[PDB]
Enzyme design. Structure first.
Site, PDB file in Angstrom:
ATOM      1  N   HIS A  60     -12.927 -52.969 -22.036  1.00  0.00           N
ATOM      2  CA  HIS A  60     -12.288 -54.245 -22.437  1.00  0.00           C
ATOM      3  C   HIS A  60     -10.838 -53.964 -22.826  1.00  0.00           C
ATOM      4  CE1 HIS A  60     -12.156 -58.451 -23.670  1.00  0.00           C
ATOM      5  NE2 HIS A  60     -11.661 -58.106 -24.844  1.00  0.00           N
ATOM      6  N   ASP A  62      -7.468 -55.718 -23.911  1.00  0.00           N
ATOM      7  CA  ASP A  62      -6.806 -56.937 -24.361  1.00  0.00           C
ATOM      8  C   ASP A  62      -5.322 -56.921 -23.944  1.00  0.00           C
ATOM      9  OD1 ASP A  62      -8.841 -58.356 -25.909  1.00  0.00           O
ATOM     10  OD2 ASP A  62      -8.972 -56.577 -27.100  1.00  0.00           O
ATOM     11  N   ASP A 174     -15.583 -61.798 -24.117  1.00  0.00           N
ATOM     12  CA  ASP A 174     -14.974 -61.917 -25.431  1.00  0.00           C
ATOM     13  C   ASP A 174     -14.419 -63.256 -25.951  1.00  0.00           C
ATOM     14  OD1 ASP A 174     -12.624 -59.974 -27.373  1.00  0.00           O
ATOM     15  OD2 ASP A 174     -14.657 -60.446 -27.854  1.00  0.00           O
ATOM     16  N   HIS A 441      -7.371 -64.504 -24.703  1.00  0.00           N
ATOM     17  CA  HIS A 441      -8.124 -64.942 -25.875  1.00  0.00           C
ATOM     18  C   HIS A 441      -7.570 -64.381 -27.223  1.00  0.00           C
ATOM     19  CE1 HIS A 441     -10.210 -61.407 -24.117  1.00  0.00           C
ATOM     20  NE2 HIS A 441     -10.324 -61.036 -25.373  1.00  0.00           N
TER      21      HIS A 441
HETATM   22  N1  LIG Z   1     -15.263 -57.255 -29.359  1.00  0.00           N
HETATM   23  C1  LIG Z   1     -14.561 -56.297 -29.384  1.00  0.00           C
HETATM   24  C2  LIG Z   1     -15.463 -55.073 -29.162  1.00  0.00           C
HETATM   25  C3  LIG Z   1     -15.991 -54.590 -30.519  1.00  0.00           C
HETATM   26  C4  LIG Z   1     -15.057 -54.310 -31.682  1.00  0.00           C
HETATM   27  C5  LIG Z   1     -15.571 -53.864 -32.987  1.00  0.00           C
HETATM   28  C6  LIG Z   1     -17.033 -53.689 -33.164  1.00  0.00           C
HETATM   29  C7  LIG Z   1     -17.991 -53.962 -32.021  1.00  0.00           C
HETATM   30  C8  LIG Z   1     -17.455 -54.405 -30.720  1.00  0.00           C
HETATM   31  N2  LIG Z   1     -13.311 -56.671 -29.590  1.00  0.00           N
HETATM   32  C9  LIG Z   1     -12.828 -58.047 -29.783  1.00  0.00           C
HETATM   33  S1  LIG Z   1     -12.865 -58.238 -31.363  1.00  0.00           S
HETATM   34  C10 LIG Z   1     -11.640 -59.407 -31.708  1.00  0.00           C
HETATM   35  C11 LIG Z   1     -12.299 -60.417 -32.572  1.00  0.00           C
HETATM   36  O1  LIG Z   1     -12.956 -59.788 -33.617  1.00  0.00           O
HETATM   37  C12 LIG Z   1     -10.903 -59.954 -30.457  1.00  0.00           C
HETATM   38  O2  LIG Z   1      -9.903 -60.888 -30.966  1.00  0.00           O
HETATM   39  C13 LIG Z   1     -10.301 -58.886 -29.613  1.00  0.00           C
HETATM   40  O3  LIG Z   1      -9.749 -59.576 -28.447  1.00  0.00           O
HETATM   41  C14 LIG Z   1     -11.337 -57.793 -29.036  1.00  0.00           C
HETATM   42  O4  LIG Z   1     -11.208 -57.241 -27.813  1.00  0.00           O
HETATM   43 ZN   LIG Z   2     -10.756 -59.188 -26.419  1.00  0.00          ZN
END
Ligand SMILES: N=C(Cc1ccccc1)N[C@H]1S[C@H](CO)[C@@H](O)[C@H](O)[C@@H]1O
Ligand SMILES: [Zn+2]
Ligand SMILES: *[C@H]1O[C@H](CO)[C@@H](O)[C@H](O)[C@H]1NC(C)=O
Length: 1014
Positions: A60, A62, A174, A441
């Site tokens: 993932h 971002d 996400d 996002h």
């Molecule tokens: N979702 C993840 C993966 C993950 C992170 C920590 C613990 C478990 C899994 N990450 C999300 S968390 C976040 C909102 O909390 C979001 O804004 C951000 O775009 C991201 O990629």
């Molecule tokens: Zn994300």
């Protein structure tokens, strides 16, 4: 054409109905904290019925969040993609899926030819597979469907050109909650499958129990099911490895081999992964296969999806190795142990879906049908993610402004083919990509760190400048005699004038048209109308004298109104908020009339005294203890008075009454009708002192909002023949109600300043008997029925208001349309409320690591439409959709796609013409040309122009409305040689059209056509 009003679709799962029934209890389900202890029958799978398991590696990435896009690309993503290339090249059986094309394109263009070829090869051979293929993985709450399509098209057009592939499977792991606008667009873009993850934990539990996690998702109004798109909802709390191998994260965490220590990661459940060896492989497989079989019980086929990834994973070569090798040992053992009756392997997302459908075609499963959305999301307890519907509202408003400028720039320049020198394609590509990036996002959602929000803002600013350059060069070409046209592609022939962005009080950026007997007697201005119907709208410009008159290019006089230029100042000395009038600048206002998708030129001329066709507004300052307000040459003296109730009526429109605090209290539609109670009120929400704190994501109020103490605010009333308004300087907000003869326009200049831990909400109180029902829109595409649920906390009843919301009873409706996405609700019968801004000192524990303290003045705009709907043909009580009226829809268009204004920069415009587009068809009001885009560069012998056409659905309430012409976009440009219906991304031809005529579309349908020209 399907009827989208009268036939209630019959579906297995209808989300509003499901919500009415569900109890949402949050009980401890055991290792699967939000579920139950899954049990399965060992004998289900056997020699003749094995469980096929696809482990799908992913990462993932971002496009900005904690770091900016370029920072993540340099520190992580380029290494992830570089190592993915090397590892997949060397290990033929390893697989990997990629979602974010913005990053992939940034990477690929930096590769040498040798590597680009190796990359095309692992894509061509199936090892590296693109999922969705959009520029980003967009937010689905605040995004406008037009920008969701824009970013999808941007990534997919890049993929087709350079990788020769078009994804048909979507991966959205996400976004915070999911919208049916996605399958709507994807199914019309060639997709066959989609996957989502962040849905309410109670919904996951409920659908799991019924094996309804995989479903055919159709639109709420689709009776036939032709909009259906197969959807897979992941079942657990996260997409990380601990929550993707099965129900027990303490066990799954042991299968994330990156968590053994040397990478700085570990398992919070206190049991670490252990390297797989011949001595422990049977016990490790026993454990893993048991998790797999438990997860399989939640679905209907014998094909199991096991995502394997997390944020910015697969960066180091040692990581690739540790994950690949250990899993290969597990697969070799499991697949050779008949007693597990499992065949596990690395796979792609398309592979999983193809196998699922092969099971379906073998009669192995039938899938339920579903309609509805997945808002508002809660990942645990009462932590509902309704805060981000409002976070960083300045940029949410900027999104809509840029959305419109991109459309206008692409449309204005599409009429001609341009020389490469003109850098038109170049500026348009940058503008589409910066707006597309912001759809991420963590972009429009307002959930990025401060310096990343600044990066998105600077990128959008450059995109806005790019659009202006292309728009003004286009206008100059479209309205100058051809034999006189002499372009300097770097020159600014016109300056755009935007009255609402950044907005008065946010930035003094508008230029004043400076006229004078000793310098310049007149100035040409030009309006553009991107909508495909004739349109009239008042437009205003700042001028250096109040003695100005308007004419069209045939020199016919145009009635105008001059008003002062008023700015509000928080007077640090007297401690009041009051307006000051300019003594050198004035606003001139007049009605412009513009052809469909066309241009209209006007001329503003100075005279040394009052012009015959220009009137001047009166101004009344209501406050105790007033001081004089001189207005230079303005011909009418400002009047003063003590605060008092006031009433105003422009033209034939409604009569509005205001309280002595300058707030609306009633609306009278016609002279006889009652003064319907409609009161605006501003309140404030706070933050809890113990427990979970509101942050950029979470809205966790310390109870119902409390009225803001207004004091005795200064109220300014301006009354003119064309436009009147009432403005009041409240703390944190200069609230303005503007009247032009129809539904009023409301503007709020919001500066939450340093009010820590406060959320400011604007509420409307009426006596409409709406009960617990209200409507909000999804991505500016459709309106969905909402039902306030007292069994859920206040924050769960908040929903995205991307462009509008309304309440209604049997006779009356009140609709509030927005020019920016904000969060809102109807917390009591007869009410509507929408959050303006929020400033939070605390982090809400979702990883952002900061509160929201970077607020800045923003100008929110709205239209407020009160109407009688007793004669309207509405959907039955059981229908989950709602529809606008013609007036509410035109009001939304006046906010999102206003006339564009251009001021000629030089002293004389030689060869100027008065109008363009006078012969364009003026289409029926419910039809829009959402996108007009030339798809070929000038060297292409056969030119192609793409069009996206959208028809909304408006309520029939007894207005005859006729005389419109059919719009055939294929004949808008001359010399058409072919007309094709294509996917919405223009990437695939779906239909060769007879007579080269593009038929119009059905209500709520969207189609794309490409016309070819010789
Ligand atoms: N979702 C993840 C993966 C993950 C992170 C920590 C613990 C478990 C899994 N990450 C999300 S968390 C976040 C909102 O909390 C979001 O804004 C951000 O775009 C991201 O990629
Ligand atoms: Zn994300
Ligand atoms: C990609 O384009 C088509 C799609 O299958 C086919 O010729 C082949 O797979 C690829 N060839 C190229 C490079 O056009």
């Amino acid at each position: 054409c399907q009827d989208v009003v009268q036939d209630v679709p019959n579906v297995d799962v209808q989300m509003l109905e499901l919500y009415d029934r569900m109890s949402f209890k949050d009980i401890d389900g055991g290792v699967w904290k939000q579920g139950w202890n899954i049990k399965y029958d060992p004998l289900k799978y056997n020699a003749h019925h094995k469980l096929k398991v696809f482990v799908v590696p992913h990462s993932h990435n971002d496009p900005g969040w904690i770091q900016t896009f370029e920072e993540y690309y340099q520190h992580d993503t380029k290494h992830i993609l570089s190592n993915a290339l090397r590892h997949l090249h060397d290990n033929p059986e390893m697989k990997f899926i990629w979602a974010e094309i913005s990053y992939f394109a940034r990477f690929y263009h930096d590769l040498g030819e040798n590597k680009k070829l190796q990359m095309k090869s692992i894509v061509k051979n199936g090892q590296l597979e693109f999922v969705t293929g959009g520029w980003v993985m967009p937010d689905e709450a605040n995004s406008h469907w037009r920008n969701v399509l824009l970013q999808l098209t941007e990534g997919q057009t890049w993929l087709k050109q350079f990788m020769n592939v078009t994804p048909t499977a979507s991966w959205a792991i996400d976004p915070f909650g999911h919208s049916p606008t996605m399958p709507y667009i994807l199914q019309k873009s060639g997709f066959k499958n989609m996957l989502i993850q962040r849905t309410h934990y109670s919904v996951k539990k409920e659908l799991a129990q019924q094996r309804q996690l995989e479903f055919l998702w159709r639109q709420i109004w689709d009776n036939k099911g032709d909009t259906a798109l197969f959807t897979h909802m992941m079942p657990f709390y996260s997409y990380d490895i601990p929550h993707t191998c099965g129900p027990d994260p303490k066990v799954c965490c042991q299968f994330d081999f990156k968590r053994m220590g040397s990478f700085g990661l570990s398992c919070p459940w206190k049991v670490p992964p252990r390297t797989i060896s011949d001595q422990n492989v049977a016990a490790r497989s026993d454990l893993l296969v048991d998790q797999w079989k438990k997860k399989a019980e939640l679905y209907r086929t014998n094909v199991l999806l096991i995502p394997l990834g997390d944020d910015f994973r697969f960066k180091q070569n040692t990581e690739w190795d540790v994950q690949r090798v250990n899993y290969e040992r597990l697969f070799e053992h499991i697949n050779s142990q008949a007693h597990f009756n499992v065949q596990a392997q690395f796979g792609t997302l398309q592979e999983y879906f193809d196998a699922v459908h092969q099971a379906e075609r073998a009669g192995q499963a039938e899938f339920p049908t579903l309609s509805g959305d997945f808002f508002t999301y809660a990942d645990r307890s009462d932590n509902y993610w309704s805060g981000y519907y409002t976070s960083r509202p300045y940029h949410k408003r900027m999104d809509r402004v840029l959305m419109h400028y991109v459309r206008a720039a692409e449309m204005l320049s599409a009429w001609h083919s341009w020389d490469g020198m003109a850098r038109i394609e170049e500026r348009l590509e940058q503008a589409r990509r910066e707006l597309s990036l912001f759809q991420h996002h963590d972009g429009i959602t307002g959930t990025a760190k401060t310096h990343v929000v600044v990066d998105y803002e600077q990128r959008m600013q450059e995109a806005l400048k790019a659009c202006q350059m292309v728009m003004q060069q286009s206008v100059y070409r479209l309205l100058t005699k051809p034999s006189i046209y002499s372009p300097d592609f770097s020159f600014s022939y016109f300056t755009l004038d935007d009255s609402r962005w950044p907005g008065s009080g946010v930035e003094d950026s508008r230029t004043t048209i400076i006229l004078g007997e000793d310098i310049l007697p007149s100035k040409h201005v030009v309006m553009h109308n991107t909508l495909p119907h004739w349109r009239e709208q008042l437009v205003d410009f700042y001028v250096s004298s109040p003695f100005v008159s308007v004419t069209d290019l045939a020199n016919n006089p145009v009635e105008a109104q001059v008003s002062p230029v008023w700015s509000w100042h928080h007077d640090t000395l007297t401690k009041t908020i009051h307006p000051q009038g300019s003594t050198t600048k004035y606003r001139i206002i007049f009605k412009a009339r513009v052809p469909p998708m066309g241009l209209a030129t006007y001329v503003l001329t100075i005279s040394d005294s009052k012009p015959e066709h220009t009137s001047y507004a009166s101004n009344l300052l209501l406050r105790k203890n007033p001081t004089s307000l001189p207005l230079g040459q303005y011909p009418e003296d400002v009047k003063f008075g003590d605060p008092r109730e006031i009433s105003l009526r422009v033209g034939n429109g409604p009569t509005l009454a205001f309280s002595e605090q300058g707030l609306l209290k009633s609306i009278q539609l016609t002279q006889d009708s009652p003064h319907v109670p409609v009161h605006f009120k501003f309140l404030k929400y706070g933050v809890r002192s113990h427990g979970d704190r509101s942050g950029a994501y979470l809205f966790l109020p310390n109870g119902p909002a409390s009225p803001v103490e207004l004091g005795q605010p200064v109220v300014l009333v301006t009354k003119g023949k064309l436009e009147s308004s009432v403005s009041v300087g409240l703390p944190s907000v200069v609230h303005q109600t503007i009247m032009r003869g129809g539904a009023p326009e409301i503007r709020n200049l919001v500066d939450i300043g340093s009010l820590d831990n406060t959320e400011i909400v604007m509420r409307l109180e009426t006596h409409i008997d709406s009960g617990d029902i209200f409507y909000t829109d999804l991505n500016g595409l459709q309106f969905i029925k909402r039902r306030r649920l007292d069994k859920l906390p206040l924050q769960a009843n908040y929903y995205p208001i991307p462009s509008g919301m309304f309440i209604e009873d049997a006779n009356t409706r009140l609709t509030l349309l927005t020019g920016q996405p904000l969060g809102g609700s109807s917390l009591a019968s007869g009410e509507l409320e929408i959050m303006q801004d929020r400033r939070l000192a605390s982090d809400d524990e979702r990883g952002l690591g900061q509160g929201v303290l970077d607020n800045k003045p923003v100008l929110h705009i709205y239209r407020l439409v009160l109407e009688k709907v007793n004669n309207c043909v509405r959907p039955s009580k059981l229908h989950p959709a709602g529809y606008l009226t013609s007036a509410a829809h035109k009001a939304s268009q006046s906010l999102l796609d206003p006339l564009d204004k251009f001021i000629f920069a030089e002293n004389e415009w030689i060869g100027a013409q008065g109008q363009f587009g006078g012969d364009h068809p003026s289409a029926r009001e419910d039809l829009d040309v959402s996108v007009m885009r030339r798809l070929t560069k000038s060297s292409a012998k056969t030119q192609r122009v793409g069009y996206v056409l959208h028809r909304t659905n408006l309520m029939q309430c007894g207005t005859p409305e006729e005389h419109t012409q059919k719009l055939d976009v294929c004949h808008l440009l001359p010399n058409v040689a072919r007309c094709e219906r294509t996917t919405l991304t223009f990437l695939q031809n779906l239909e060769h059209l007879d007579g080269m005529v593009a038929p119009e579309v059905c209500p709520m349908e969207t189609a794309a056509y490409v016309s070819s020209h010789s």
